A paper describes a structure:
CC chemokine ligands (CCL) comprise 8-14 kDa chemotactic cytokines (chemokines) involved in diverse immune functions. Extensive structural analyses reveal that most chemokines share a common core structure: an N-terminal extension followed by a 310 helical turn, an anti-parallel three-stranded β-sheet, and an α-helix. CC chemokines also readily dimerize, primarily through the formation of an anti-parallel β-sheet at their N-termini. Certain chemokines, e.g. CCL3, CCL4, and CCL5 form polydisperse, high MW reversible polymers in excess of 600 kDa without the assistance of GAG.
CCL18, also known as pulmonary and activation regulated chemokine (PARC) among other names (e.g., MIP-4, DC-CK1, and AMAC-1), is a primate-specific CC chemokine expressed by macrophages, monocytes, and dendritic cells upon infection or inflammation to attract T cells. We next found diffraction-quality crystals in the presence of citrate ion via a high-throughput sparse matrix method and solved the structure of CCL18 at 2.1Å resolution in space group P21. There are two CCL18 dimers in each asymmetric unit. The overall CCL18 monomer structure consists of an N-terminal segment (aa 1-21) followed by a 310 helical turn (aa 22-24), an anti-parallel three-stranded β-sheet (aa 25-56), and an α-helix (aa 56-69). The two monomers within the CCL18 dimer adopt distinct structures at their N-termini; one has the N-terminal extension (aa 1-6) followed by an α-helix (aa 7-10) and the other has a largely disordered N-terminus (aa 1-7). The N-termini of these two monomers (aa 2-5 in one and aa 8-13 in the other) form a network of hydrogen bonds and van der Waal contacts between their N-termini that bury a substantial surface (~549 Å2). The dimer contacts of CCL18 are distinct from other CCL dimers, which form contacts at their N-terminal region via an anti-parallel β-sheet, exemplified by CCL3. We find that the N-terminus of a CCL18 monomer within CCL18 dimer adopts α-helical conformation, which is distinct from the typical anti-parallel β-sheet shown in the other CCL dimers. Such an interface weakens the interaction between CCL18 monomers, explaining why CCL18 prefers the monomeric state in solution. Examining the contacts between the symmetry-related CCL18 in our CCL18 structure reveals a 630 Å2 buried surface. This permits the formation of a CCL18 oligomer that can be extended at either end in a zigzag manner.
Author numbering:
A (entry chain D): 9 to 68
B (entry chain A): 1 to 69
Write the structure that this text describes.
């Protein structure tokens, strides 16, 4: 059910991101949800290199 | 609004089940064109949201009464 419609243009500083979630493949759009230290859940574009770079390291 | 850019924040997934008393609504806003179903977000004075179906007569009436004054 949970999906992204608008992606953030804010390249959230990596150390302000505590985790991320991927959205269902049934969503019309692909999306990852970034969770910030302030507890916001912010949709971001997985086709964006900066988002991909954060995910690659956030896994470590 | 913990959520930013998601359907749950930009769409009406479930309308109010009942007609709201008119005194509560002072404004409204549109939902995303990407939403699977129609919806308008009605706004209370406290800045709080109630999702509603634009196809309802009372919804159109409420909005019209606000705009025409």
């Amino acid at each position: 059910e949970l999906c992204c419609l608008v992606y953030t243009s804010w390249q959230i500083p990596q150390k302000f991101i505590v985790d991320y979630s991927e959205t269902s493949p049934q969503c019309p759009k692909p999306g990852v949800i970034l969770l910030t230290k302030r507890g916001r859940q912010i949709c971001a574009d997985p086709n964006k290199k900066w988002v991909q770079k954060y995910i690659s390291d956030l896994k470590l």
